[PDB]
Amino acid sequence: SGFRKMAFPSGKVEGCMVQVTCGTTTLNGLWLDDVVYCPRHVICTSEDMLNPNYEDLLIRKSNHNFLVQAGNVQLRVIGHSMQNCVLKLKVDTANPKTPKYKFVRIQPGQTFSVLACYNGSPSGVYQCAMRPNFTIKGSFLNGLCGSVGFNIDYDCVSFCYMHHMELPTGVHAGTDLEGNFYGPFVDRQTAQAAGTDTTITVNVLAWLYAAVINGDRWFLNRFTTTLNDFNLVAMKYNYEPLTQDHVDILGPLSAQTGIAVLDMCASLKELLQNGMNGRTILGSALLEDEFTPFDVVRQCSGVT
Amino acid sequence: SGFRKMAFPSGKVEGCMVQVTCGTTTLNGLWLDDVVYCPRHVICTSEDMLNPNYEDLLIRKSNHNFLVQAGNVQLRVIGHSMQNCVLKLKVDTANPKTPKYKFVRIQPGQTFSVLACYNGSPSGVYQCAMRPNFTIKGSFLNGLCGSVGFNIDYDCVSFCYMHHMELPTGVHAGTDLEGNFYGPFVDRQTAQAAGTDTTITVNVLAWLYAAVINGDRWFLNRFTTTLNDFNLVAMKYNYEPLTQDHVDILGPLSAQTGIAVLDMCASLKELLQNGMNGRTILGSALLEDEFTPFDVVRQCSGVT
């Protein structure tokens, strides 16, 4: 037993991280087959970042102005292009460590592992959720742009996120691997609003099931509720509305524990209205919303 | 900015994980040079585990009774021996992925990354502290024994932990790579007590510094204190006593923030006595003690 926020093993991704430099700006790129993907703001000076005209900036840059380095070894850049907010640098050498991969645009409420890297060197790994407002709560600094978020299904790496920026609230924003931002953000240094950060109700429920599975059950009350009833309470706390799809998705956990989803909702309702009274659930003193039902099943089942 | 519990990149360790099977018991082993290290209870049936005589059990086992598998490929076992609570299986093939490594016995209060593996297949990665009572709060199930805990310093992997068992409290126990338990535990299925789990005071302080660095400062009060004064309060809450060594270790963080260690102690004292009043610090509603000063510096500095 025990339940922990855990990231996917990062080995397959480590082997794809390179350092990309243009002028005095350095960040990370992702080397897959003969292409290196990186944030287009690698072409900006600190001045440019305030209001960059990327089309105009990129035109002053040739292949040889992009310095790409995997370990101590240079890659030869033989082409460049800009796709939305990412550059693709064609190199003359296919990464011999390229794993099977795809590019995916992840839905809000889903989770992924981030391999924090500094100027091409893997630094550490942790789990994030894509929040309903299309931000993540990460740990990023200068040099960590181009670090990627991914999931692994056996041998397939699904890349879903590349890091670009931080908002005034201290949360993080970035793109899929086609360079399209998650959320309304743009890659320039101006103040930008994410909007109200709502709680991922289905994830809270999953974690409450996790807790029950791992012996924590003090919060199981004698009440039930309905979706409409629970959702009237949800709105009040800026929880996402629960739908039947979410009910269905929790099916396996409901079965495994013998606790109806609406009974757990009633329990969640009393926690929201009455707080925790200084108690903890899976060693947290607030309601955790960054574990998906999959995340919970994967851990509690354990196998593979 | 932002502060996250993050594990070391796990690639170097992934390449050392193998599956060890003896009879119907399967678990993980660590393959370094021509040696595979695994928990000696791989030799037990479910019955034996209640009260195993390992010396007697091991004598019924020959080299060929240990099935060792890295991916789909068998290793040939050419020798076996028992060192404390681990078996060493000599194999005829040096692991070509062996990184530079050492074996270290970690101190209580220090942290490490765990690569959770299931029957030889890496599953995920997360950070643990070795608690003052020499337990860890992990996530482990059958099949995850032999999963290892480590730290990385540039290219050197320091292995410090191998997983063996779970205590009635749901916490975890294991050995160094010489097979010596952390704490008073033994590898048999009987009820065993860890004793009072004290809070790692120096780590709490470091995390409070992390918070200040990352903009959270509502808890900075107008008081100071002394070590003896603070330690009288520490004892009451089962915090570890603060010593000058801990003061010194916090030096870099004290300097970086301009907050004297004893001022932060005074702030910690008021948090202990008055609670959080429903507020959060780095998105937690309790006091976090699983980040070392190093962990905090490493993240906040970021570089390398």
Numbering used by the authors:
A (entry chain A), B (entry chain A): 1 to 304
Which sentences from the paper describe this structure?
Mpro is a cysteine protease that mediates the cleavage of viral polyproteins during viral replication and is a high-profile antiviral drug target. The SARS-CoV-2 main protease (Mpro) is the drug target of Pfizer’s oral drug nirmatrelvir. The emergence of SARS-CoV-2 variants with mutations in Mpro raised the alarm of potential drug resistance. The X-ray crystal structures of the representative Mpro mutants S144A, S144L, M165Y, E166Q, H172Y, and Q192T with and/or without GC-376/nirmatrelvir provide a structural explanation for the drug resistance.
S144 is located at the S1 pocket and is part of the oxyanion hole consisting of two additional residues G143 and C145. Four mutants—S144L (183.3-fold lower in kcat/Km), S144P (523.8-fold), S144R (478.3-fold), and S144K (534.0-fold)—had significantly reduced enzymatic activity compared to WT and increased resistance to nirmatrelvir. GC-376 is a veterinary drug candidate for treating cats’ feline infectious peritonitis virus (FIPV) infection. All mutant complex structures including S144L showed the inhibitor and the protein assumed conformations very similar to those of the WT. In the unbound state and, to a lesser extent, the complex structure, the S144L mutation led to a drastically different conformation in the 140–146 loop, as well as neighboring regions to avoid steric clashes caused by the bulky leucine side chain. Interestingly, in the GC-376 complex structure of S144L as well as Q192T, the thioacetal hydroxide is placed outside the oxyanion hole and hydrogen bonds with H41, unlike most previously determined structures.
